[PDB]
Amino acid sequence: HMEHNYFYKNSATLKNKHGIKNPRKLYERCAHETAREAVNFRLEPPPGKFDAAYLRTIHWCLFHKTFEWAGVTRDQPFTFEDGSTACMPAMRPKGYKVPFAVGSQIQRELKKLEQRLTAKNNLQGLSRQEFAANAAEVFTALDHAHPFRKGNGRTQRMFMEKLGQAAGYKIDFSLITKERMTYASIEAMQHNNPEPMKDLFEDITHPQKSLLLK
Ligand SMILES: Nc1ncnc2c1ncn2[C@@H]1O[C@H](COP(=O)(O)OP(=O)(O)O)[C@@H](O)[C@H]1O
Ligand SMILES: [Mg+2]
Numbered sequence: 428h429m430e431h432n433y434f435y436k437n438s439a440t441l442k443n444k445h446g447i448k449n450p451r452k453l454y455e456r457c458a459h460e461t462a463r464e465a466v467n468f469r470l471e472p473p474p475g476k477f478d479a480a481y482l483r484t485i486h487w488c489l490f491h492k493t494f495e496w497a498g499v500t501r502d503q504p505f506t507f508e509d510g511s512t513a514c515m516p517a518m519r520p521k522g523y524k525v526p527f528a529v530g531s532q533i534q535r536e537l538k539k540l541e542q543r544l545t546a547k548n549n550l551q552g553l554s555r556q557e558f559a560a561n562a563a564e565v566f567t568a569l570d571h572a573h574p575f576r577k578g579n580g581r582t583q584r585m586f587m588e589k590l591g592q593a594a595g596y597k598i599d600f601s602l603i604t605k606e607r608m609t610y611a612s613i614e615a616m617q618h619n620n621p622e623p624m625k626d627l628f629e630d631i632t633h634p635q636k637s638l639l640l641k
Contacts, residue, residue, distance in 0.1 A: 432513035473593035479537035527573035595638030
């Protein structure tokens, strides 16, 4: 029942802060704003902890001017200013059999990822090949958790950019198409094939000057 409360009454337009009722216009406005917020967010230093709180902070920075629920995961009830409450504990990509994390799996998976990152020292001290493989595993874990109602891709990509930066690697998603990212995501989650994601991260990553100069 509560998932309908993400939309205006009898509409396919997500409730938003921009004053927009046209779903196409909302998409374009949001795309432009999240791109700009990403440019500005890149100026912020990477944190010492790459945790679920940080992921929520990224989503909030990218989306708070668009959605009231920016930074809030979809397992959690969210009450809009209009007094209605929304959430969406279960989500499955269209056309596909394998769903994203359901309900409390979202928190459990983000906790497991946090622990893995801590154990691996945020992927510091790796070879280029190792870093790419490990970054791909982190990304597929994020993909499955899919913690937000919308905006997961933009965030996950920002989380990776900052994780990379703190580990001495530049990860540049602009080097590839959306289609390639989608393909790699589908292969990993729908077809249990982790290779395309590994190749993707190899292709868009290089060690930074400092990591070379050291
Ligand atoms: N069928 C799928 N199975 C698993 N992951 C997918 C699938 N399709 C897309 N993805 C990935 O899910 C993530 C979120 O996609 P995105 O386009 O940001 O949607 P949203 O805005 O709904 O969160 C991206 O990393 C994307 O590549
Ligand atoms: Mg997105």
